[PDB]
Design a protein around this nucleic acid. Structure first.
Ligand SMILES: OC[C@H]1O[C@@](CO)(O[C@H]2O[C@H](CO)[C@@H](O)[C@H](O)[C@H]2O)[C@@H](O)[C@@H]1O
Ligand SMILES: [Mg+2]
Lengths: 412, 553
RNA sequence: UCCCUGUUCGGCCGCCA
RNA sequence: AGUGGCGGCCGAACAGGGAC
């Protein structure tokens, strides 16, 4: 019997209507189940053809569960409420949570199961459950409470949340807490043993206000960056210096201090490619002073909260991936690398979904945004297999690029 | 009386009102039939007369079938449909006969007056207002508005399948061991009861449906497979597509090929191995539908062999959820593939085709992975699992590809088959520069205006070449400079280009390309022994690449 | 100007009610 | 001279990223 905060769509934008893609029968019987008991509890109620709105839904298995999780694809419903959850009831960002020597993740989705939902807005959050070979027409539901995975649910509930957390924030004044969609990030400078206790503390302190937690430990200080590496060689061949001058000249777009003039004199004839050449001293100097300017971060590159985050991934072979997070071209806000993760040297898509997920956390922690993804894969390959290896509770917005390695710059 | 089954609330588009358009002229032969039907629908209750308080009106006419007395009523709902709300179709596709599990008793039942048995929502019944005259000019005429879902509205199909889901919905909880698939106005009821007890539950369902206003005549064909349904023949233990009649023309028009290709393309889902690449290669740049076009020797070679696959009738089996799915691919050359899904060998479930030359420049490993991604979804749809894959590419060829390709590529669990032609990689760019081979520093340039341009090379030995080009591009002159270097080189060669475009194309080991020029480069790469290709950036005064650009400007 | 990608709307033939 | 759907063909705008 709680009063309902009203929700309305952004000016002049219709609700989401996204087609529901086919599903493996193993995620059908489970989503047929998760909705039987959510309807028996009243969390959702069946609808009919008068609703022209639909949002995708599928099933993930969180890491080592054997108990399925229901996950809905709210990206098109999300980007259509944006003035509600950005300009109005937003969530501020704890600039220092990234400094913490340790950070734990906890799934607070059960708490959205209670608080009721505005009656105008439950027509835009309807999802269909498919059946195999188009037998039963799709068993279309809709959401009577604050749904899981929406970006308006942590904006409405943040009040009832601050009160539930208010005893524990006064009890530990150093600890830093940030809340993103269905997830909660708790951060302290305590040591991993004393740290694992404090979460169990917040686990029951929230369990007594009705939150049931279905550990995930981050270490934002230990995080490394990816160096723009030039080769170090005893002997250079005509071929080696063209590859090098190509990297520096491809590099001159970020670090404006690089120079290629004196190493190009080194290539003054129309020579064979494997011929070894002596580096002049003006070129040993050009080579060194370049190896320096790369030791420094890019200049004047600072996060701009109005701009979207962009993340590009490059597949460097042998189970290693490179990536860059940016907002404007050649102004890199972060770089990284991933190696021999799960699915190492056995599966690439398993590897990328691991790559995409581990990148989304790094950005939510440092900027409170889900970076937009440029995926190096064809579209039907990602759709068909991603949710098998997807374990997160959010879903970032992505596009697929067909880019060859004109320069395989990032490692070599 | 008011309606037996629950109504379905409808609304207009925001800020829009009903349709107002006056009727066409129509001959006295058709007009006489409609006034009879309107009182036959009025007597049965599908319509009601109304005064002039209803400003909305929408046209009507009729069409008569050949060799048949029956008429089709029609409503020009164009303006009502423009302003009727969006619906979310509850029909995400059409079920396919290979997906039917095996059951003892299969009964096909047909709803009579299917859309005419659902109640149009009382609030909306106003916009369904139409006018019909007795004679073409004399009678002023009467106005009537709808009491049911009308043939020809934009929600009449989306609503019927939603209400009729509420109707079959308890019956399914009453008989879990009997399954009812529902498409449109036909119903397929199947069980593992005997042929006698299947006639008892058929009357049980006939009557449970009668409880809601649905009439299933006994005039229907009984349990006598082959049931004709969707253009197929569904037999007791097998199924096949309805036999195919090919136009036997001594002269072919474009209407002849377009109608023929669709028949061949429909044949492929059970008849294995049909090809259509060259019969459609004739229909590419065609403008007139009736104008004749000749069949080249290839396209004529394509018509004869296909005609021979269809001589014998073929059939597939059904899905048996305890046996696994094993899907097998064969190459057809010229970028065409055919495949069969089965469970017990030589008992094919279905067959199929994938031929999309996708991308401008594709090889046999990209194309084999594209056929896999389409068999995988066509199997997730029909049987809801990923089949096991028999694939004619060596376990080592595929191991070299995905490790080296720059896009992440995966294939589910698969095994090798040695049914030649095996699919393999036709060459390999070296990773370190060849010693002792002439190094060709190539570049090309053209003028967008004049479409004239040059392509050429300067090497280490001093050799040069520039070739003028006519009606060409800047991209197409760079792809040509590299072709000059491959002709004019030995079996071992180096090439330095500043073309990101060309270096991208080549590096993807592509053996079949749509541009006849790219196929020139593939053949010279196949004939070399060691090719090494590298990129330098342009206008950085690198070696002779700074120079040869001057010769090509 | 150039290429590929993706999305989103349109013309005719064949099939269904 | 209606609508929806399925197969075939042809294009039309919109947006993406790269190549000059
Ligand atoms: O791979 C993109 C694919 O997803 C769909 C529907 O699920 O669109 C979603 O993804 C887009 C790209 O991230 C989002 O921008 C969009 O909001 C979301 O609906 C398809 O439209 C698209 O083919
Ligand atoms: Mg040039």
């Amino acid at each position: 019997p709680i009063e309902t905060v009203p929700v309305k769509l952004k000016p002049g934008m219709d609700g989401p209507k996204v087609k529901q893609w086919p599903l493996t029968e193993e995620k059908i019987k489970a989503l047929v189940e998760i909705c039987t008991e959510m309807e028996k509890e009243g969390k959702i109620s069946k609808i009919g053809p008068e609703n022209p709105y639909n949002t995708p839904v599928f099933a993930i298995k969180k890491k080592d569960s054997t108990k399925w999780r229901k996950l809905v694809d709210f990206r098109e419903l999300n980007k259509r409420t944006q003035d509600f959850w950005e300009v109005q009831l937003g969530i501020p960002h704890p600039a220092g949570l990234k400094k913490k020597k340790s950070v734990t993740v906890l799934d607070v989705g059960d708490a959205y199961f209670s608080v009721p939902l505005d009656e105008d807005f439950r027509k835009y959050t309807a999802f269909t459950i498919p059946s195999i070979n188009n037998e039963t027409p799709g068993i279309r539901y809709q959401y009577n409470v604050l749904p899981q995975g929406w970006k308006g649910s942590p904006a409405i509930f943040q009040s009832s949340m601050t009160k539930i957390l208010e005893p524990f924030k006064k009890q530990n004044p150093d600890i830093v807490i940030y809340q993103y969609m269905d997830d909660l990030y708790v951060g302290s400078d305590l040591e991993i043993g004393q740290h694992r206790t404090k979460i169990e503390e917040l686990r029951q302190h929230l369990l007594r206000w009705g939150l049931t937690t279905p550990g995930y430990e981050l270490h934002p200080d230990k995080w490394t960056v990816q160096p723009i590496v030039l080769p170090e060689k005893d002997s250079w061949t005509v071929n080696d210096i063209q590859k090098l001058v190509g990297k520096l000249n491809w590099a001159s777009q970020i670090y404006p201090g690089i120079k290629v003039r004196q190493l190009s004199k080194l290539l003054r004839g129309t020579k064979a490619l494997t011929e070894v050449i002596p580096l002049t001293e003006e070129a040993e100097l050009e080579l060194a002073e370049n190896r320096e300017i790369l030791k420094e971060p890019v200049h004047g590159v600072y996060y701009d909260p109005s701009k979207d985050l962009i993340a590009e991934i490059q597949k460097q072979g042998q189970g290693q991936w490179t990536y860059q997070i940016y907002q404007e071209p050649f102004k890199n806000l972060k770089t990284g690398k991933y190696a021999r993760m799960r699915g190492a040297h056995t599966n690439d898509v398993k590897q990328l979904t691991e790559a995409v997920q581990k990148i989304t956390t790094e950005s939510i922690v440092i900027w409170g945004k889900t970076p937009k993804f440029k995926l190096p894969i064809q579209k039907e390959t990602w759709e068909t297999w991603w949710t098998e290896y997807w374990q997160a509770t959010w879903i970032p917005e992505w596009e697929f690029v067909n880019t060859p390695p004109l320069v395989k710059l990032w490692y070599q | 009386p008011i309606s037996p089954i629950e109504t379905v609330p409808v609304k207009l588009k925001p800020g829009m009102d009903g349709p107002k358009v006056k009727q066409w002229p129509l001959t006295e032969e058709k007009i006489k039939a409609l006034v009879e039907i309107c009182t036959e629908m009025e007597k049965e209750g599908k319509i009601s007369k109304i005064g002039p308080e209803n400003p909305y009106n929408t046209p009507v006419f009729a069409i008569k079938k050949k060799d048949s007395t029956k008429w089709r009523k029609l409503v020009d709902f164009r303006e009502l449909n423009k302003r009727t709300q969006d619906f979310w179709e509850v029909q995400l596709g059409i079920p396919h006969p290979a997906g039917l599990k095996k059951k003892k008793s299969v009964t096909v039942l047909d709803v009579g007056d299917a859309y005419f048995s659902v109640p149009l929502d009382e609030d909306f019944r106003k916009y369904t207002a139409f006018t019909i005259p007795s004679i073409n000019n004399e009678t002023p005429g009467i106005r009537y508005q709808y009491n049911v879902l009308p043939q020809g509205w934009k929600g009449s199909p989306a609503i019927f399948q939603s209400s009729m889901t509420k109707i079959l919905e308890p019956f399914k909880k009453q008989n879990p061991d009997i399954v009812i698939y529902q498409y449109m106005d036909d119903l397929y009821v199947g069980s593992d009861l005997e042929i006698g007890q299947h006639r008892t539950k058929i009357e049980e369902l006939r009557q449970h449906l009668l409880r809601w206003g649905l009439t299933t005549p006994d005039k229907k064909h009984q349990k006598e497979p082959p049931f004709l349904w969707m253009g197929y023949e569904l037999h007791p233990d097998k199924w096949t597509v309805q036999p195919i009649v090919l136009p036997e023309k001594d002269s072919w028009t474009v209407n002849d090929i377009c109608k023929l290709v669709g028949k061949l393309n429909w044949a492929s889902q059970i008849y294995p191995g049909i090809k259509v690449r060259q019969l459609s290669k004739l229909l590419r740049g065609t403008k007139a539908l009736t104008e004749v076009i000749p069949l080249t020797e290839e396209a004529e070679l394509e018509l004869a062999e296909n005609r021979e696959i269809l001589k014998e009738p073929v059939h597939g089996v059904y899905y048996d959820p305890s046996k696994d799915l094993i899907a097998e691919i064969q190459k057809q050359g010229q970028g065409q593939w055919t495949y069969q899904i089965y469970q017990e060998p030589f008992k094919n479930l279905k067959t199929g085709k994938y031929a999309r030359m996708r991308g401008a420049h594709t090889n046999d490993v990209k194309q084999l992975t594209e056929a896999v991604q389409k068999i995988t979804t066509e199997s997730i749809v029909i049987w809801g699992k990923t089949p096991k894959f028999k694939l004619p590419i060596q376990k080592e060829t595929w191991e070299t590809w995905w490790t080296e390709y720059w896009q992440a590529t995966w294939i589910p669990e698969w095994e090798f088959v040695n049914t030649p032609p095996l699919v393999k990689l036709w060459y390999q760019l070296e990773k370190e520069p060849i010693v002792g081979a002439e190094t060709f520093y190539v570049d090309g340039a053209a003028n967008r205006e004049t479409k004239l341009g040059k392509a050429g090379y300067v090497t280490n030995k001093g050799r040069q070449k520039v070739v003028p080009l006519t009606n060409t591009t800047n991209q197409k002159t760079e792809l040509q400079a590299i072709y000059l270097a491959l002709q004019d080189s030995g079996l071992e060669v180096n090439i330095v280009t500043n073309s990101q475009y060309a270096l991208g194309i080549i590096q993807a080991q592509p053996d079949k390309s749509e541009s006849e020029l790219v196929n020139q480069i593939i053949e010279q790469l196949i004939k070399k022994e060691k090719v090494y290709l590298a990129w330098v950036p342009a206008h950085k005064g690198i070696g002779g690449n700074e120079q040869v650009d001057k010769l090509v400007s």
